[PDB]
Amino acid sequence: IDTDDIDEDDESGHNIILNIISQLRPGCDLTRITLPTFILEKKSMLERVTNQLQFPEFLLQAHSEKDPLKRFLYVMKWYLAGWHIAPKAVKKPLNPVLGEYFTAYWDLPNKQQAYYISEQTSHHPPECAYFYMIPESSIRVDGVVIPKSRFLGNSSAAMMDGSTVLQFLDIKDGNGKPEKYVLTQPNVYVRGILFGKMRIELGDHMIIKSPNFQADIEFKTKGYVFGTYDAIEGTVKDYDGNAYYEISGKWNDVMYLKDLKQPRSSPKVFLDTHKESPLRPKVRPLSEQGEYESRKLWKKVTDALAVRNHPVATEEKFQIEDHQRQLAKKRIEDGVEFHPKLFRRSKPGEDLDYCIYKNIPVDEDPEKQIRSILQIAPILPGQQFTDKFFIPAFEKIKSQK
């Protein structure tokens, strides 16, 4: 098996965790606390986000669907499909260093490409932004991940205040603007850390809203007197408050839709997570990557994890963490603050805290859009870094004038 699917929490590891908890007080921030390497998957958070994007076929179905209601369902299908793409063991992504970046691409079966660009925009508190686009299909995705980790006793939680904005550039609304979907994230809980075994749960409410429809999906939480893990329930409505469908089932098994105009009918299969197959992103080889590009930067750490050598993993991890600490001290001494290389700060009225700095006009030719994307950062094999890359986003935006 892969190390991501192997629980490495034996008697020794459980002692390390229990010991850390001993010094903790309920409500504590877990962001400022170094955690053992045996609960780490071999990915940065920047790459973990791409897991959720491994079903572009559903997204392509949505964009191609003419019926508004069915288009919404296909969007909901695309988004729900990615959550089971995760380690089977209770493990978490690496906490990306400040200014860390990650790029990847997809070779789509319709012989088009999908491009992905991301950057860790903040460390205290941790936060990252990502850009995703399939220009030849007029599909654009912008998002941020904002984890707020807390110790709560027998439970620890990562409250997810991030969100994702999906746009169909060639599908206009009542304003002439591209059809926009806003998708929030459920919270990630870990239970049974004190007494018993550890298990990861998704909880609370996920919202998906379009110009015409809206869906409040609840990720139900398992109780003591039971039962069932991983259950969801929600409704698809228009803004007149009319209910069209009910979603049910399990986000890691099979999810169903029940047509509410047929009150006697039984919920039919909406998404089988065992049926369709995920499409993994492609990445440049290490020999082309930058010093603080995710996979290269963490290479020594992931190598050690891949063979379960934790003394070495913790050591290599510490070196990286300690260097960043040094850099933070130097910034204070020089009287400067960090500025993202690839993402600008939000303007008033926008949906996200960060947005890709490159201006990509809505009704521009897809070929020229791809050209603009490739100028942002090295994505495809053979692409070369430039001096412009390391210039802060806000300076690059000051330019173009």
Ligand SMILES: CCCCC/C=C\C/C=C\C/C=C\C/C=C\CCCC(=O)O[C@H](COC(=O)CCCCCCCCCCCCCCCCC)COP(=O)(O)O[C@H]1[C@H](O)[C@@H](O)[C@H](OP(=O)(O)O)[C@@H](O)[C@H]1O
């Ligand atoms: C009390 C012990 C509990 C042990 C449990 C063990 C494992 C549970 C595994 C899964 C998570 C489960 C639930 C979450 C519950 C609470 C635990 C949160 C875990 C957590 O705070 O890690 C922390 C990092 O901050 C995240 O990493 C925040 C990221 C949180 C990751 C969870 C999110 C996973 C789901 C991702 C889905 C993505 C959604 C995609 C959105 C849709 C896209 C379309 C700490 O770790 P760490 O040593 O790598 O981080 C270090 C950091 O590397 C170092 O530089 C810092 O030094 P300084 O501070 O001196 O510089 C140091 O303070 C510390 O930050």
